[PDB]
């Protein structure tokens, strides 16, 4: 029943500092070390560093040699990773893991790996401010022939909005493309559904947009031109 609960999502900005937390539970805390890992969106894993929960010795990667600090708290069994000088390419999901590659007491190399991992903590870093979706319709073509339609959740920040259709009715054939960051640092998403060509001007297609950080819940109606 080893488990590592971890802090919530952060939306920081350039130049700032972040401190993610990782609460260990279900094992003898002082017997293992803690490793921190990082993964950029659509990229590979890359190591950050290691800390000994027993005598406090740390071992950092060359890339982060000084930009980062790790701490431990034995009473509550908690690990902390704090990053500074946040650039824009430091956007990533950061993971906490229990370590078996380096002993806590004697600090030597072990036969093993990162056996228990955390849940991840997205840390977006960008020069911008919170915004809301500018939902637009995309109606079927002039020739009424199965076709597709959708709505364009555009120009919104921060990260995820939730797009549903008729409060979860026509899930069969719902494609919600991953958001792509634009050139002005602002996410735009497209949601599309395919419907039979003979049932276009007979139903009511409304897409639901839930951008919580701005508390917006638009049930936007898309009607063919």
């Amino acid at each position: 029943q080893v488990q590592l609960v971890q802090s919530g999502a952060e939306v920081k900005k350039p130049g700032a500092s972040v401190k993610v937390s990782c609460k260990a539970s279900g094992y003898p805390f002082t017997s293992y070390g803690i490793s921190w890992v990082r993964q950029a969106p659509g990229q590979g894993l890359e190591w950050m560093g290691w800390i000994s929960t027993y005598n406090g010795n740390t071992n950092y990667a060359q890339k982060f040699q000084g930009r980062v600090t790790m701490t431990t708290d034995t009473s509550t069994t908690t690990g902390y990773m704090e990053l500074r000088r946040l650039r824009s390419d430091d956007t990533a999901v950061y993971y906490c893991a229990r370590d078996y590659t380096r002993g806590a007491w004697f600090g030597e190399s072990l036969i093993g790996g990162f056996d228990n991992w955390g849940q991840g903590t997205l840390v977006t870093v960008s020069s911008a401010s919170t915004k809301g979706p500018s939902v637009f319709p995309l109606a079927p073509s002039s020739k009424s022939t199965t076709a597709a339609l959708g709505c364009l959740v555009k120009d919104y920040f921060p990260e995820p909005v939730t797009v549903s259709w008729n409060s979860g009715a026509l899930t069969s054939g719902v494609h919600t493309f991953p958001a792509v960051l634009q050139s002005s640092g602002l996410y735009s998403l497209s949601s599309v559904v395919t419907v039979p060509s003979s049932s276009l001007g007979t139903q009511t297609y409304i897409c639901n947009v839930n951008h919580k950080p701005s508390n917006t819940k638009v049930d936007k109606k898309v009607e063919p031109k």
């Binding site: 894993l45 993971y95 078996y100 190399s109 093993g112 790996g113 990162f114 056996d115 955390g118 849940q119």
Partner: peptide
């Protein structure tokens, strides 16, 4: 051979250890 490992990551989840020591299987 005592210091090489493999990991598996499913989409949307965190990784998980599979093989350590290049032959041994994890729990």
């Amino acid at each position: 051979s005592t210091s090489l490992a493999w990991y598996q990551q499913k989409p949307g989840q965190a990784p998980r250890l599979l093989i350590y020591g290049a032959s041994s299987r994890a729990t």
